[PDB]
């Protein structure tokens, strides 16, 4: 069934599962034509496929050439996502294939279900959670590899850096969703928080800065403040 507040700890049990977010697959800039009409120009996108227990991220880069001469792209984007996720599963060894795939948007249910007909035992699930994975392109290293790609490409990351050496998956996922929720509501402020102290660096093999445990508590506090305010600065409270 659907994933929500009440069955949240299932994410961190020992059944392999992936989140699939398609919000950054088909990306456009909308502009004006010489005649004064409006046209879109596509830029590179990505499928955000995440193991919430391990932090393994399968970032399938979607090159703009995919869209050449295609119609109804926003519809095609959902089917292209499902084709690539199915290809990813088929590429994994059987003991690594997920038992569940949770789509962050319900319009991915039928496209993924049809592409996974070969996998009757893999459950395709929606979610009632409003997860902030659209903000993944606010992580500089992920944005950089997507924009520089010249062809279709899969890039593997651990979105938790080394956090699982010190914290649980539940705690790591909560930190991740707090960081992304902050980048989503006010990117500039979120990014200022993460970089204010020049002495804390991002390791070459990491996505996020190398905070001590005490510094993460301060950072996480600052991100909460931001999210509440922007919710005040929005609804005035």
């Amino acid at each position: 069934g659907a994933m929500n507040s009440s069955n949240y700890a299932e994410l961190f049990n020992n059944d392999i599962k992936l989140f699939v977010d398609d919000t950054n697959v088909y990306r456009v800039t909308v502009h004006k034509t010489f005649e004064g009409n409006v046209a879109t120009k596509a830029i590179n996108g990505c499928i955000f496929t995440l193991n919430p227990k391990t932090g393994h991220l399968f970032l399938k880069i979607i090159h703009t050439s995919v869209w050449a001469g295609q119609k109804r792209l926003s519809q095609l984007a959902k089917w292209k996502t499902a084709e690539e996720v199915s290809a990813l599963v088929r590429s994994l060894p059987k003991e690594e294939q997920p038992k569940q795939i949770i789509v962050t948007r319900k319009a991915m249910l039928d496209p993924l279900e049809v592409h996974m007909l070969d996998f009757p035992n893999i459950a395709i699930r929606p979610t009632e959670l409003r997860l902030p994975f659209s903000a993944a392109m606010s992580i500089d290293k992920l944005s950089d590899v997507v924009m520089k790609a010249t062809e279709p490409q899969m890039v593997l990351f651990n979105i938790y850096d080394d956090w699982l050496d010190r914290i649980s998956s539940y705690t790591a996922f909560s930190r991740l969703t707090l960081l992304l929720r902050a980048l989503k509501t006010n990117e500039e402020s979120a990014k200022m928080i993460l970089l204010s102290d020049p002495t804390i660096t991002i390791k070459s093999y990491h996505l996020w800065p190398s905070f001590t445990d005490e510094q993460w508590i301060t950072i996480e506090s600052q991100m909460r403040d931001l999210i509440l305010t922007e919710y005040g600065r929005k609804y005035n409270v």
Partner: protein, 300 residues
């Protein structure tokens, strides 16, 4: 013209014959139905006055034998039976017709409704959907479930309709996932018409039979099957032109004949709104769309 005689009528019951029906009182001297038009299948059906639960009935074709009804007080229903002895049966029917103990199949000569609802329905195909080879006629009731319903429990009493499932490997060509799910022509024309049904006549016959079992018995699995078979055609961008014109006529007479007060359960909103207004064939069902709009615009 043929005749289906009744030994007796021991319990109060509403008897239908095709789209007609009449009330028979307990132990009323009712001995059958005469002037039944030859050349069509027919359905005789029953709703007891005391247990509106269980509508049930018999599909038959008077060319295939001499059939009659007798109340079984053990099993508690009107049963159809076949009479081997041809002059014993002609004796029975004549003696009855002389005592004028039979109702007349009340067809208006202008009226082609039954023909139009049963145009492609053949007994041979019915007998394959309702499996019971020791009888020339076929029993159906409100509660029987379909093969596909059983999959998702007594197979002897199943309706073995052709299984249609839009998110199935039979329906979706590997590599054409999006193409086949959004345009079902492959599944319609190659898988179902060419492969399973062989021709559109046998497809239309199963469609018509499912509708009639939904209407006369309130059979839910049959209603599901009727809607599925409509949706497969309307969701195909490529349908033979003769099929589309004929589908319009078929659906027209089904909606025309449906009880105005049963449209809440026997009609599926999603299927009809997609078929008349969103699908490839939104413009190829003028007669059906016209009568649906003037008679069920709430649904839409």
């Amino acid at each position: 013209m043929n005749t289906v005689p009744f030994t007796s009528a021991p319990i109060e019951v509403t008897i239908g014959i095709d789209q007609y029906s009449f009330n028979v009182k307990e132990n009323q001297p009712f001995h059958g139905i005469k002037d039944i038009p030859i050349g069509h299948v027919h359905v005789i059906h029953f709703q007891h006055a005391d247990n509106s639960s269980m509508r049930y009935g018999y599909w038959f074709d008077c060319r295939m034998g001499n059939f009659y009804i007798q109340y079984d007080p053990k099993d508690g229903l009107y049963k159809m039976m076949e009479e081997r002895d041809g002059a014993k049966f002609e004796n029975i029917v004549h003696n009855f017709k002389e005592r004028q103990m039979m109702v007349s199949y009340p067809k208006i000569d202008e009226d082609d409704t039954w023909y139009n609802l049963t145009e492609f329905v053949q007994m041979d195909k019915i007998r394959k959907i309702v499996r019971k080879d020791e009888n020339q006629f076929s029993y159906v009731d409100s509660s029987m479930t379909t093969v596909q319903e059983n999959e998702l429990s007594d197979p002897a009493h199943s309706l073995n309709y052709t299984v249609i499932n839009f998110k199935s490997r039979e329906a979706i060509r590997p590599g054409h996932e999006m193409e086949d799910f959004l345009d079902k022509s492959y599944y319609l024309n190659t898988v179902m018409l060419q492969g399973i049904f062989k021709n559109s006549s046998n497809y239309f016959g199963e469609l018509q039979f499912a509708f009639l079992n939904a209407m006369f018995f309130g059979n839910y699995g049959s209603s599901l099957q009727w809607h599925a078979m409509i949706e497969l055609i309307c969701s195909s961008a490529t349908v033979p032109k003769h099929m589309l014109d004929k589908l319009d006529e078929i659906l027209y007479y089904q909606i025309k004949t449906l009880p105005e007060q049963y449209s809440d359960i026997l009609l599926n909103e999603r299927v009809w709104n997609i078929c008349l207004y969103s699908s490839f064939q939104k413009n190829s069902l003028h007669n059906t769309e016209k009568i649906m709009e003037n008679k069920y615009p709430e649904l839409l």
